[PDB]
Amino acid sequence: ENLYFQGHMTLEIRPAVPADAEQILAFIIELADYERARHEVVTDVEGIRRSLFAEGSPTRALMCLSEGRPIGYAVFFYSYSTWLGRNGIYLEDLYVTPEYRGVGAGRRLLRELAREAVANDCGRLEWSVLDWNQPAIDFYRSIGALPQDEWVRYRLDGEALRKMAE
Amino acid sequence: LEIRPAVPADAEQILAFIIELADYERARHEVVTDVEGIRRSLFAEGSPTRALMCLSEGRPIGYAVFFYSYSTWLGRNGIYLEDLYVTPEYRGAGRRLLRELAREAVANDCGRLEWSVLDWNQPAIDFYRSIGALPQDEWVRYRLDGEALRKMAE
């Protein structure tokens, strides 16, 4: 004998502010750790605070909270399609703490980005997922998102980038 | 050869090149915009997107289109290169366009310069390999557009 029932909490989504930096970094680390890349986080709180909230930063961040109490975040920026001749939005990070993965916070963050895209005349909302991350893939497939698997992303960074400039 | 920022007057030439590139990428039919649409978006007041023109002796020979990304791991902006193209009769202009983008990346405190390539496009892959670029092939890009995007918003 036991009993299951629905609980209801009011959740909040708001734009992030400079004071959110320490929490945002905390969540960035948690996400990177889930993505098996903890060691790749090389920034610090002031690095995040300054770059994310610079005047004319291309990047925007949202916080998700419960009587908050932050429970998740998203970081995104505008992209462009030359084929559509329209801006798009690219979602870089999306994360909800494990404890709160059932309440629909992740989905609503993604929905609000979609609303922003449509409201701003954008052709596409896009993001990336690790090929081994089947739970996330299942979710993205379920909402009608489609893989762009003909494309491979290439990167210049570190010394190779410096040499290309020099 | 000359590399310069694109201006609204370049829109016609940019679109012609966009179509040339799309055609090579086996996607000519995906270009659904006109010059007007390019003007209104690419050259909108407050536009997040930039373009570079490559010219040889006053003649436009190629272009790039790019925007700023962000790495939460690095705590740094990056640049994402959407389009890079040099017309056949002039194919080292492409390398020159990339150099300018890299210089822009370095001056603007960017950690990464990135772009995408079709897996069948071996000439592009060969070129990118030759400049020290590395494939980020653990990731798959996902997209919502059209009805799926509209329905998600609602």
Show me where the domains of chain A are located: 1-166
Q: What is the resolution of this structure in A?
A: 2.0
Residue from B44, B36, B142, B133 nearest B84 by CA: B133
The size of the A-B interface in CB pairs under 8 A is 244
In A106-125, the residues whose Cβ lies within 8 Å of chain B are 110-111, 114-115, 117-118, 121, 123-125
* Residue in B67, B132, B137 nearest the CB of A163: B132
What residues have CB less than 8 Å from A33, skipping those under 6 apart?
Answer: none
Maximum C-alpha span of chain B: 52
- Architecture of domain B1-154 in this structure: 3-Layer(aba) Sandwich (3.40)
The CATH number of A1-166, from 3.40.630.30, 3.30.230.10, 3.40.50.300, 1.20.120.530, is: 3.40.630.30
Determine which of A83, A143, A148 to mutate to test the interface with B (most B C-beta atoms within 10 Å): A83
Which positions in chain B touch A31 (Cβ < 8 Å)? Answer: 72
* Residue in B41, B74, B77 nearest the CB of A42: B74
Q: The sheet that has A70-81: what strands, in order across it? A: A11-15, A59-66, A70-81, A86-96, A124-130, B139-145, A146-147
Q: Helix or strand or coil: residue A26?
A: helix
The span from the CA of B70 to the CA of B112, in Å, is 9
The span from the CA of B104 to the CA of B108, in Å, is 6
Kindly give the pairing relationship between strand A124-130 and strand A86-96: parallel
